[PDB]
Coordinates of C-alpha atoms and ligand atoms in Angstrom, one line a residue:
X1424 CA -12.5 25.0 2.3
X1425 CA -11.0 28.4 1.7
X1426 CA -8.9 28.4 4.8
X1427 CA -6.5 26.1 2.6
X1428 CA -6.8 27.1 -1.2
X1429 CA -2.9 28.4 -2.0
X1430 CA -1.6 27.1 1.1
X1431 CA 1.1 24.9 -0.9
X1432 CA 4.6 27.5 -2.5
X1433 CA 8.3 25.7 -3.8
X1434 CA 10.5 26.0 -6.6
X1435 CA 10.9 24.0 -9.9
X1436 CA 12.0 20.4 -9.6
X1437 CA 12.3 21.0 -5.6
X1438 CA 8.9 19.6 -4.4
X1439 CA 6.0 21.6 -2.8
X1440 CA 5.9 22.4 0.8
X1441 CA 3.1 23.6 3.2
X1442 CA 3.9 25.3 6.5
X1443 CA 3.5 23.4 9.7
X1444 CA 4.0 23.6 13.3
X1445 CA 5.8 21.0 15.5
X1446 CA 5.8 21.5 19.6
X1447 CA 4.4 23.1 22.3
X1448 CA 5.0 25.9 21.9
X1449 CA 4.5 25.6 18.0
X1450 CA 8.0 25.6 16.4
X1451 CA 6.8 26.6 12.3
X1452 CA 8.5 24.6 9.9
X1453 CA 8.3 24.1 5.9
X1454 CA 7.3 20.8 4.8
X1455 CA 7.8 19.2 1.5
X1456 CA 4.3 17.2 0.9
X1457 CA 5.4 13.3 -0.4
X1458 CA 2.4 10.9 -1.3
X1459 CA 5.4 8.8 -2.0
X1460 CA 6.7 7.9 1.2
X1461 CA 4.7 8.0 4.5
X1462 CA 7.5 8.9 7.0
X1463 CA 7.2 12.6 9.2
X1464 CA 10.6 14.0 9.0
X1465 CA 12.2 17.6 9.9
X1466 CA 15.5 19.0 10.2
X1467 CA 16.4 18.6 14.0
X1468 CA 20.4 19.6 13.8
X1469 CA 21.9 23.1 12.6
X1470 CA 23.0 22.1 8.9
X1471 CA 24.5 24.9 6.8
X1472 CA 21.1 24.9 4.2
X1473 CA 18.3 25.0 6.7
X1474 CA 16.4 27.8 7.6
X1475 CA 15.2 27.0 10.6
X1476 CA 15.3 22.9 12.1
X1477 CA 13.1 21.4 15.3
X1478 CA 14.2 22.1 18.6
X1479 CA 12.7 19.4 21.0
X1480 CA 14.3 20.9 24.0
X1481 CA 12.0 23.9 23.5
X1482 CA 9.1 21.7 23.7
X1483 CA 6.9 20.4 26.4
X1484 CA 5.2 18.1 24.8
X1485 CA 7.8 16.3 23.1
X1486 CA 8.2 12.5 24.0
X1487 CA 11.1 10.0 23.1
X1488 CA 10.7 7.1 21.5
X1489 CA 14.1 5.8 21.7
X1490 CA 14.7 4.3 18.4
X1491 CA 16.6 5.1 15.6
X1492 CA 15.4 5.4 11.9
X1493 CA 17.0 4.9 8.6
X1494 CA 15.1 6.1 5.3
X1495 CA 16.7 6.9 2.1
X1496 CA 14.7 7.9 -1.3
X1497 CA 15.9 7.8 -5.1
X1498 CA 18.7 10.1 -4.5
X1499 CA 18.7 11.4 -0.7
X1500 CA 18.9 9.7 2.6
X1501 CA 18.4 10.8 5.9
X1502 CA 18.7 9.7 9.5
X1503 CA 16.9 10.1 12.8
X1504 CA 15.5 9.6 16.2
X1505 CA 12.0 8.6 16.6
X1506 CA 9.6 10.8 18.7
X1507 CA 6.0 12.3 18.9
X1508 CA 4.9 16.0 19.5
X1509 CA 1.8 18.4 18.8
X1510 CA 1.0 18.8 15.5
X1511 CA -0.5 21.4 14.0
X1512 CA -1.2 22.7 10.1
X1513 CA -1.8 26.9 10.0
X1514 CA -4.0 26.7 6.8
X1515 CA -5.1 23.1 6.8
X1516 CA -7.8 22.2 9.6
X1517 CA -8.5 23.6 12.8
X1518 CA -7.0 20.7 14.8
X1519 CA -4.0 19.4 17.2
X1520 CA -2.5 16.2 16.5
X1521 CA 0.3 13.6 18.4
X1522 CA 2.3 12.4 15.5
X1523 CA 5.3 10.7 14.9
X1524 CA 8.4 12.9 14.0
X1525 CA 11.5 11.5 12.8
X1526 CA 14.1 14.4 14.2
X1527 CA 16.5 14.2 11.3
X1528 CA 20.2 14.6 13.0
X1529 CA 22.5 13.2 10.2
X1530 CA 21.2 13.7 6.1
X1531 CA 22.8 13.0 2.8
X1532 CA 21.6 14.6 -0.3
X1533 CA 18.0 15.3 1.0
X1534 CA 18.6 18.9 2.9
X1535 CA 19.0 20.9 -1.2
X1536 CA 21.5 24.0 -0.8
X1537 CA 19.0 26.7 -1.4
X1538 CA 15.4 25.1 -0.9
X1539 CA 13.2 26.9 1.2
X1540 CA 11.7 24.0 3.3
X1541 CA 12.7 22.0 6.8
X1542 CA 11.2 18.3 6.4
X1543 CA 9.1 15.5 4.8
X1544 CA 5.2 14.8 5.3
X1545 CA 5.0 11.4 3.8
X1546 CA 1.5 11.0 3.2
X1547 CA 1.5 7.2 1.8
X1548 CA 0.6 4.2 3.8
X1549 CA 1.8 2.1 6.7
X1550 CA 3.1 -0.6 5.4
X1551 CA 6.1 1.7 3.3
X1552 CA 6.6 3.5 6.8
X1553 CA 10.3 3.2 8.4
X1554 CA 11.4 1.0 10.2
X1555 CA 8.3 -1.0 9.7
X1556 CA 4.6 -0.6 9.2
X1557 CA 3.7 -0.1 13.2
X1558 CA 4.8 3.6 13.0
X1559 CA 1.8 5.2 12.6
X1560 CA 1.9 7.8 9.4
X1561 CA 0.9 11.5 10.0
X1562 CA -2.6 11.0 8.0
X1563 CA -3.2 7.9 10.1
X1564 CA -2.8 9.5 13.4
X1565 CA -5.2 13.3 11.8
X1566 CA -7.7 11.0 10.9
X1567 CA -7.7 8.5 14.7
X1568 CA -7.5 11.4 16.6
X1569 CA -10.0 14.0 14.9
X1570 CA -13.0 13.6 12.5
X1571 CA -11.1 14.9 10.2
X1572 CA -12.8 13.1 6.9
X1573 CA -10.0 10.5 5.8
X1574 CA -9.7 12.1 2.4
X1575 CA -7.2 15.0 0.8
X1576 CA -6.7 16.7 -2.5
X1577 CA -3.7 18.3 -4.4
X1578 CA -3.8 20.9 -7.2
X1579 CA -0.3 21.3 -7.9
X1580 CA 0.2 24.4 -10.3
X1581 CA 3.4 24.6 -11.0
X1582 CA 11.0 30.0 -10.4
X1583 CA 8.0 30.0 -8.4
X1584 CA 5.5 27.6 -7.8
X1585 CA 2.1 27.0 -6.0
X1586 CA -0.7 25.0 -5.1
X1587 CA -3.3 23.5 -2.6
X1588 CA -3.7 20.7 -0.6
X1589 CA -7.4 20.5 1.0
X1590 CA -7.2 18.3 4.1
X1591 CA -10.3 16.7 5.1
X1592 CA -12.2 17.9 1.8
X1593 CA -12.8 18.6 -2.3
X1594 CA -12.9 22.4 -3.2
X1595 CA -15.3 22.2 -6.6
X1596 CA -13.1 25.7 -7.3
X1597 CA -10.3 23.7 -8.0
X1598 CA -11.3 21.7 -11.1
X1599 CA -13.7 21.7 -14.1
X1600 CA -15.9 19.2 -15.6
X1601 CA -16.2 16.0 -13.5
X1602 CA -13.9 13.6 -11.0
X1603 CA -12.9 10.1 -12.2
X1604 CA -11.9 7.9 -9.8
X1605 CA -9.1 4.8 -10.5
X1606 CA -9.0 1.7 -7.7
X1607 CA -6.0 1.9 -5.5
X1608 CA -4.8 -1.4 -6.1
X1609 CA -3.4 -1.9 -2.9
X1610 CA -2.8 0.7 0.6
X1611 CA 1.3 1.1 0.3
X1612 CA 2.1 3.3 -2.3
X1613 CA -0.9 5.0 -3.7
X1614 CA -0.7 2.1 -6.9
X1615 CA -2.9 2.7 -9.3
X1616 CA -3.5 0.6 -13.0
X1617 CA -2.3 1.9 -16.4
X1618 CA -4.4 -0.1 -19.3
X1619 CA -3.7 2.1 -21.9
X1620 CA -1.0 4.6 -23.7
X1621 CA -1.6 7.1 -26.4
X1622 CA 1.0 9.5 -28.0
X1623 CA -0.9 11.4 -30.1
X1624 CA -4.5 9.7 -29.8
X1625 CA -2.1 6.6 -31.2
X1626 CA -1.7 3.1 -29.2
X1627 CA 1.9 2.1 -28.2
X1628 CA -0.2 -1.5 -28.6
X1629 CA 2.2 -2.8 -25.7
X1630 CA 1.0 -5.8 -23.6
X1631 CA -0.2 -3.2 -20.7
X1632 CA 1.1 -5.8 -17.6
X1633 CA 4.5 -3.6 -19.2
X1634 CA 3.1 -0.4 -18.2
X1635 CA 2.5 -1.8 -14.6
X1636 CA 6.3 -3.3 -14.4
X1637 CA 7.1 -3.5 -11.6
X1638 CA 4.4 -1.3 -10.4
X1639 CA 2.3 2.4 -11.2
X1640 CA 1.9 5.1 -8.4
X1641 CA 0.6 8.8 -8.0
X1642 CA 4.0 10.8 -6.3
X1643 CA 4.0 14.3 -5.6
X1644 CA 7.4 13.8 -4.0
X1645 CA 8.7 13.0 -7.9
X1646 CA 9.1 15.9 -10.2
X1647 CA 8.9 13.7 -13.7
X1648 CA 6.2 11.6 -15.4
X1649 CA 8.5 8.1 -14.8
X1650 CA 8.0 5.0 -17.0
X1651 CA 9.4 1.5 -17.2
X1652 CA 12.4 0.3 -18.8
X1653 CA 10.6 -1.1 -22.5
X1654 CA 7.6 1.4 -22.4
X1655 CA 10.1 4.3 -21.5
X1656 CA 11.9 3.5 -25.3
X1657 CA 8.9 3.0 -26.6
X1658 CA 7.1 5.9 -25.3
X1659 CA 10.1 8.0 -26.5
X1660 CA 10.4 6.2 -30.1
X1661 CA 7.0 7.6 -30.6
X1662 CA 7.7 11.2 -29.5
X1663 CA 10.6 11.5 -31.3
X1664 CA 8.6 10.1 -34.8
X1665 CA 5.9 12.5 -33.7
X1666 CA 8.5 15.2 -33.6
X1667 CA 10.7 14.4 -36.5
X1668 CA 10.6 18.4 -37.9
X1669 CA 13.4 19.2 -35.4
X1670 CA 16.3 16.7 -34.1
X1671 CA 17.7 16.5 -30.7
X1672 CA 20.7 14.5 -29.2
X1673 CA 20.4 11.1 -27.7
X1674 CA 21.6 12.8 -24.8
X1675 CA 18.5 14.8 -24.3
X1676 CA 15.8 12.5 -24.4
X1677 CA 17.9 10.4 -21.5
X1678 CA 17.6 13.7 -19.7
X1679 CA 21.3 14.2 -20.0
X1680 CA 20.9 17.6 -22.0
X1681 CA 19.3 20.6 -21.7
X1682 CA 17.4 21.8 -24.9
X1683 CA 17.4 25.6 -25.9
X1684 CA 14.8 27.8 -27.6
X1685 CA 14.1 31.7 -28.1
X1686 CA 11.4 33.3 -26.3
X1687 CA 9.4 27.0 -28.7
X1688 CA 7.4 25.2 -31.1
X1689 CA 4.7 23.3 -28.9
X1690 CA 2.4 22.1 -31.7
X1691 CA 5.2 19.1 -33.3
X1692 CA 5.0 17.8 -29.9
X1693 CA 2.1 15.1 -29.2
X1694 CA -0.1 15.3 -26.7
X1695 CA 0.2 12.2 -23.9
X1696 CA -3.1 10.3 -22.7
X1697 CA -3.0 7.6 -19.9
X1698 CA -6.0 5.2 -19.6
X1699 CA -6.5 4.3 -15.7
X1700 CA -8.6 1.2 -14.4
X1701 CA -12.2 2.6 -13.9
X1702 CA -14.9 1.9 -11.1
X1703 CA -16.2 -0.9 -12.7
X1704 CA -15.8 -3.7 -14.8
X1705 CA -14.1 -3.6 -18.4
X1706 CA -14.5 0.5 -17.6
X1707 CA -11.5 2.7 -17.8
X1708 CA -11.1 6.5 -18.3
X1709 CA -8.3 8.3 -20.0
X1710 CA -6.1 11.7 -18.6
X1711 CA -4.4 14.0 -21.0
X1712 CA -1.4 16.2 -20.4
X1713 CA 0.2 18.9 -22.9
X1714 CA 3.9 19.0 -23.7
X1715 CA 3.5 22.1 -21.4
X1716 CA 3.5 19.7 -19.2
X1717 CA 6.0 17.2 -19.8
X1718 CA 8.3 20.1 -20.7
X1719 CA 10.3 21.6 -17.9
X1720 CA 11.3 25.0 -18.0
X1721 CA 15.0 25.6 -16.4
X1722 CA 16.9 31.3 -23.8
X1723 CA 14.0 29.2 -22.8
X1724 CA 16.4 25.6 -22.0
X1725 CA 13.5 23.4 -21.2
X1726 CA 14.4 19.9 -20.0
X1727 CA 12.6 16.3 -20.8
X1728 CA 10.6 15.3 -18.0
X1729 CA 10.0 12.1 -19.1
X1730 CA 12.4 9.6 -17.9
X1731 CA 12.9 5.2 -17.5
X1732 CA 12.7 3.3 -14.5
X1733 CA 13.8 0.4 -12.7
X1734 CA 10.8 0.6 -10.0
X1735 CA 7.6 1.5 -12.2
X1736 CA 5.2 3.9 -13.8
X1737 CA 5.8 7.4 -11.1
X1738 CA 2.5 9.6 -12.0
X1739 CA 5.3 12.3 -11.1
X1740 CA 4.2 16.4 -10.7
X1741 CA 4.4 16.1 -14.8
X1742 CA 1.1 14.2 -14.4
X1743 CA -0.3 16.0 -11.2
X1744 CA -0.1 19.6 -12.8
X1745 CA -2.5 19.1 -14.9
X1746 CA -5.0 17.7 -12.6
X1747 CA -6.9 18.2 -9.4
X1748 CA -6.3 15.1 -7.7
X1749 CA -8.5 13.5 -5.2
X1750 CA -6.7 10.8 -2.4
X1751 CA -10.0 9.3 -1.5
X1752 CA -8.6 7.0 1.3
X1753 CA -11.9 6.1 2.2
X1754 CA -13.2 4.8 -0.3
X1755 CA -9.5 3.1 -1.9
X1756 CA -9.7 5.3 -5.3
X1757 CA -8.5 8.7 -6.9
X1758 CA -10.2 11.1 -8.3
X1759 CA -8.5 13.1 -11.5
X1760 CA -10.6 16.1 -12.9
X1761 CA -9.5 18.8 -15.2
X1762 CA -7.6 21.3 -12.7
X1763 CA -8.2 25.5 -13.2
X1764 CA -4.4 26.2 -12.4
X1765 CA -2.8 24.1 -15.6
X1766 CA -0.6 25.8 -17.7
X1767 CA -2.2 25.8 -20.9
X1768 CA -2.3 27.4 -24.8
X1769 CA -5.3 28.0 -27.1
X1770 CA -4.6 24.7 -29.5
X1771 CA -4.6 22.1 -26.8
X1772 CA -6.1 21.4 -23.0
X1773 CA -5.4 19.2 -20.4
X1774 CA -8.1 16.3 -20.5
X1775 CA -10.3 14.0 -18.2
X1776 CA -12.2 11.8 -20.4
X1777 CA -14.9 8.6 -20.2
X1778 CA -16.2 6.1 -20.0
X1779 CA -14.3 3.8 -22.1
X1780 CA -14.6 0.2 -23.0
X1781 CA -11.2 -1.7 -22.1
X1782 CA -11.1 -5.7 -21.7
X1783 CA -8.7 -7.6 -19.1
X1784 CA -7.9 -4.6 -16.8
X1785 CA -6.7 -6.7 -14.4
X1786 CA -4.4 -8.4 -16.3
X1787 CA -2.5 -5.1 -16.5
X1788 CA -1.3 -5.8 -12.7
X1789 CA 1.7 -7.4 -12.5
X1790 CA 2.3 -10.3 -9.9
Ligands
0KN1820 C1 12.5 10.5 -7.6 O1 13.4 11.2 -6.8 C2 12.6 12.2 -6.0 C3 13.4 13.5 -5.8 C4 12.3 11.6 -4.7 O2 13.1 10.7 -4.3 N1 11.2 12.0 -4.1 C5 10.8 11.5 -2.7 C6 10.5 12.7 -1.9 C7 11.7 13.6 -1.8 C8 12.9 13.0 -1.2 C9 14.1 13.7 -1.1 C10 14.1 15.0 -1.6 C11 13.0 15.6 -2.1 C12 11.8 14.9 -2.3 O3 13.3 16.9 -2.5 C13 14.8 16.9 -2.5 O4 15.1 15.9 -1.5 C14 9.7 10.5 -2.8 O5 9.3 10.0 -1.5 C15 10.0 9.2 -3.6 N2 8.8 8.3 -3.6 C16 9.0 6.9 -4.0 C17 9.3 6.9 -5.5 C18 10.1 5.5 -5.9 C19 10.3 5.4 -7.4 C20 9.3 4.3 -7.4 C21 9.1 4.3 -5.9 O6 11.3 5.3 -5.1 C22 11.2 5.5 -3.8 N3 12.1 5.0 -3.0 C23 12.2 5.1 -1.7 C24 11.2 5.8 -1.0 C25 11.2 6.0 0.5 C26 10.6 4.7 1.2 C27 11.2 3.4 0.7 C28 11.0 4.8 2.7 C29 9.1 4.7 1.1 C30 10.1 6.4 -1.8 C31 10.2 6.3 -3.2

């Protein structure tokens, strides 16, 4: 799968993108890859920050749908008319799809003054599409229309960035050691379980339905490991006690400040393992990530990338750097193995480890 190793380039905190063509003839366009939202999306209109936006009149193949569309993120909304077009990704597979492309003529917040990309590939599932869960995503339509295997994989890298996504496939170049694989609990989001916490091989001993509140997902879309209100202060409580040498402001851990150092004291800072839901019954694995990881660099001012929530666990591009991450859609599951990109020092490695013995897994899922 070679074709499509390094095919994924953006900036810090920005998202990653992969290059795509829209039309007939093909019109090449940036796209930010989301597997938290499941919308197709580009620039359609001249604004001030793009680089290049979809021309429809240019294209042959282009057909209206004659609806409108409404879809607004965290921070960021956009607006658009509904269509489909030929579809085609340069380094991804050798194939030609009809897809369903929101042509974005009015945006708020979303277009970043700056960013190098054009539009959204929301690789999530139907029933999170806008305006409801009969627009067909762009994964949906690759996988009806080709045979395309209904699996893809991200090795985020991580002010340049870089990655991979294999469409269709697992590159065994991209990770070390061996895949574990966590139930997606249910085809929206891609919602995983969270049984278990350690900072520091130490248990947060929180009831784990709070880990799960209101819900856990994998998002490349999301730059920061994201955690629920109570485990959040929690979470934090024990990374500040594990890092009591040095003091910071309040300010800082609320992502509010930026926090300086000369060209950085990693060991002080605790290593953070998540225990997911395993294959099978009363099993569970664990994933490790580095402060390396959870610290983002933006003097060396790094910010917190750790951050409370009002809508779940987000398993953020914190979590995904450090991982090869497999979006079996096949088989409901994803895989997490050990990626060969994460950043990295001599005392400490990113982890993928198991079997372990957890009780009431399902418990953890809140209803
Ligand atoms: C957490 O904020 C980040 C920046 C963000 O909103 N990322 C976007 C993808 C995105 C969106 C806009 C962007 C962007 C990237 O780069 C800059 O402009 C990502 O899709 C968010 N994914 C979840 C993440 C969550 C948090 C828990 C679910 O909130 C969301 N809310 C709305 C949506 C859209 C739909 C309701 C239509 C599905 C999705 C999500």
């Amino acid at each position: 799968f070679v074709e499509m190793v390094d095919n994924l380039r953006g900036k810090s905190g920005q998202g990653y993108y992969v290059e795509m063509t829209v039309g007939s003839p093909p019109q090449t366009l940036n796209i930010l890859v989301d597997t938290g939202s499941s919308n197709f999306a580009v620039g359609a209109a001249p604004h001030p920050f793009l680089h290049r936006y979809y021309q429809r009149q240019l294209s042959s193949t282009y057909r209206d749908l004659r609806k409108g569309v409404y879809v607004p993120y965290t921070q960021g909304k956009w607006e658009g008319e509904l269509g489909t077009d030929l579809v085609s990704i340069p380094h991804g597979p050798n194939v030609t799809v009809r897809a369903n492309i929101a042509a974005i003529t009015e945006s708020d917040k979303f277009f970043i003054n700056g960013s190098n990309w054009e539009g959204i590939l929301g690789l999530a599932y139907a029933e999170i599409a806008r305006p409801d869960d009969s627009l067909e995503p762009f994964f949906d339509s690759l996988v009806k229309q080709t045979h395309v295997p209904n699996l893809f994989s991200l090795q985020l890298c991580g002010a340049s960035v870089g990655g991979s996504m294999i469409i269709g496939g697992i590159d065994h170049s991209l990770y070390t050691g061996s895949l574990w694989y966590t139930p997606i609990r249910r085809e929206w989001y891609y919602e995983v379980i969270i049984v278990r916490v350690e900072i520091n091989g130490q248990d947060l001993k929180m009831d784990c339905k709070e880990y799960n509140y209101d819900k856990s997902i994998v998002d490349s879309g999301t730059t920061n490991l994201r955690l629920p209100k109570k485990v959040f202060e929690a979470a934090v409580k024990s990374i500040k006690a594990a890092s009591s040498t040095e003091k910071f402001p309040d300010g800082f851990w609320l992502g509010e400040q930026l926090v300086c150092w000369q060209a950085t004291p990693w060991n002080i800072f605790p290593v953070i393992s998540l225990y997911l839901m395993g294959e099978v019954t009363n099993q569970s694995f664990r994933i490790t990530i580095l402060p390396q990881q959870y610290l983002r660099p933006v003097d060396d001012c790094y910010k917190f990338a750790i951050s409370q929530s009002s809508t779940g666990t987000v398993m953020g591009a914190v979590i995904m750097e450090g991982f090869y991450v497999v979006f079996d859609r096949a088989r409901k599951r994803i895989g997490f193995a050990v990626s060969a990109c994460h950043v990295h020092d001599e005392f400490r490695t990113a982890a993928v480890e198991g079997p372990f013995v957890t009780l009431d897994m399902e418990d953890c899922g809140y209803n």
